[PDB]
Design a protein around this ligand. Sequence first.
Ligand SMILES: *C(=N)[C@H]1CN(c2ccc(C(F)(F)F)nc2)C(=O)N1c1cncc2ccccc12
Ligand SMILES: *C(=N)[C@H]1CN(c2ccc(C(F)(F)F)nc2)C(=O)N1c1cncc2ccccc12
Lengths: 300, 300
Amino acid sequence: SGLVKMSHPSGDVEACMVQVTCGSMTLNGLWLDNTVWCPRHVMCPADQLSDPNYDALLISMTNHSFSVQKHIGAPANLRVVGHAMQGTLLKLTVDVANPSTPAYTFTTVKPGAAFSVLACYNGRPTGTFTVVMRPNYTIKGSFLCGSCGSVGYTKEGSVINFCYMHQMELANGTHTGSAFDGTMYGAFMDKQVHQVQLTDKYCSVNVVAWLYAAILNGCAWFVKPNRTSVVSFNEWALANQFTEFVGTQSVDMLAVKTGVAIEQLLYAIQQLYTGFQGKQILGSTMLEDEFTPEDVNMQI
Amino acid sequence: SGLVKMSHPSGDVEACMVQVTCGSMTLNGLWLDNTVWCPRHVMCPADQLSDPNYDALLISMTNHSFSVQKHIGAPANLRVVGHAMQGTLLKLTVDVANPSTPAYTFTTVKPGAAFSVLACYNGRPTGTFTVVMRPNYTIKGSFLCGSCGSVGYTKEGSVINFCYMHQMELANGTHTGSAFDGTMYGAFMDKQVHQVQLTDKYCSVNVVAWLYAAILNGCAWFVKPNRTSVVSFNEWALANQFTEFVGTQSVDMLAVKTGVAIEQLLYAIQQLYTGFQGKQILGSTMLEDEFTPEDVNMQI
Ligand SMILES: *C(=N)[C@H]1CN(c2ccc(C(F)(F)F)nc2)C(=O)N1c1cncc2ccccc12
Ligand SMILES: *C(=N)[C@H]1CN(c2ccc(C(F)(F)F)nc2)C(=O)N1c1cncc2ccccc12
């Protein structure tokens, strides 16, 4: 009966992690069946990192240019028999299919959605955590050198939903990656160049869920009879760095169980954005937008 | 590079999770070699919860009073051939040794130390998170009905360091369990009786580590030339709900890499405790004591 940042048990994804090496650069890869996905900037030499032509680099590559290694479980050196490019990713074909490939789809997450990340270094998973695709299409994770290729995923039912592969840290401290169709979140460029991300915004539907979790945990000092409509809140949300509140059935279940209307929490969000009264909500003196409405329904 | 709450990859522990059923009650169990550890209150009937004689309950039980089931991976016919009691735990002996038993040690964690938890329900893992053993010998996790038996662990090197098994929820978001020697953290009783935990306290060495992580991430607005000695801070800590600061070599490295003395941060704690002037330290308006000095050195 509490709310903590929770990640899916990584036992499925650990067996899929490999180490792809192309020349002098090496990063992580995802081994599903006879396919190994890895960020395409492993082909780029350090000399041409500012103006790389990945179309020409892919042409200059042969199957022997790449080296895939499996360090976890029973080790195995994978022979690369094919190399292709899909967006900002490499689609390598290996001679051995992963015997532990879980049921998987490739789905792109929207802002506000949360997913688990398996941080890996040299093809060895070291840690796992949960991040939210921020409205500026970035994630607030913990990535070090060589973590490129770490995989973000979900599990709807018995299917692992791959949705993120770590691509780069922007030197602003900003982590970003691409979906498994190659399209980089936020249209960030692979090349090394000055890149500034858009201004971040609070995920309004995640704050409402977090407040519902506090009420379910016996913390409802912030609940007042005052209400602000969803239409009026979205107008206020424009001029104060907040996302448009779009109610879902997951939020409706929290409204019924707690008995607190959504418009009651939208008003409370405005007052809480103007500062707390010194009191804490679930051990936090700040608005927490990292818990989705489905995350709250699950943990309660 | 960032700083987040990070859990160990749960692949090793997922292969050890089983389901223990003693008559009408059912909880999770840890399957290591031929031994299945589980909370001893599974053999207690619902009508004898207020005052159970576990010495008499263990006598009344036989090997067929328990039934262990493996749901994860390849299911197995787990036959119980022996039952013993160790403190607040049951040491069941099964006819099959777990083929995926990792190298494991049993260690009691001290307050302030962090460890990863694999929450399970009916012997099936559902989520993972990291908790710090609070000074009042509780943990602030997210457990639901049927979560008892969930395992807390570390991984030093290639060895899983088991240190926690879930026992009971004391209040909303307040949980406690026992070490794998049987002794329950904080001497909390198994019976359903009034139990009040001690007043919680901030882990001073974890706050110092968390401030060092902010300095390494370019967030050092709180650093001032002022210093308060460890001896003076510990006197203040006694009357302000703080733990005695005992410097380690892990904290010394952060003091060298940042150039900020430990005494400087001890003074900043005594100022930030009163309040953050609307200024965020790594996106937090409160003192975070959930990051150990070893956790900061790893994530930087
Ligand atoms: C990932 N392993 C590294 C390398 N990297 C990177 C960025 C851009 C490009 C190119 F050529 F422009 F396309 N190539 C490589 C990058 O951003 N890295 C990275 C990623 N996440 C975190 C960190 C932390 C520290 C150092 C490097 C990081
Ligand atoms: C864990 N599976 C449940 C059960 N439980 C509990 C059962 C018996 C006894 C006693 F007194 F020893 F006999 N004590 C405790 C308990 O505390 N549970 C539990 C644990 N964590 C979280 C929750 C949340 C909701 C309901 C029960 C929880």
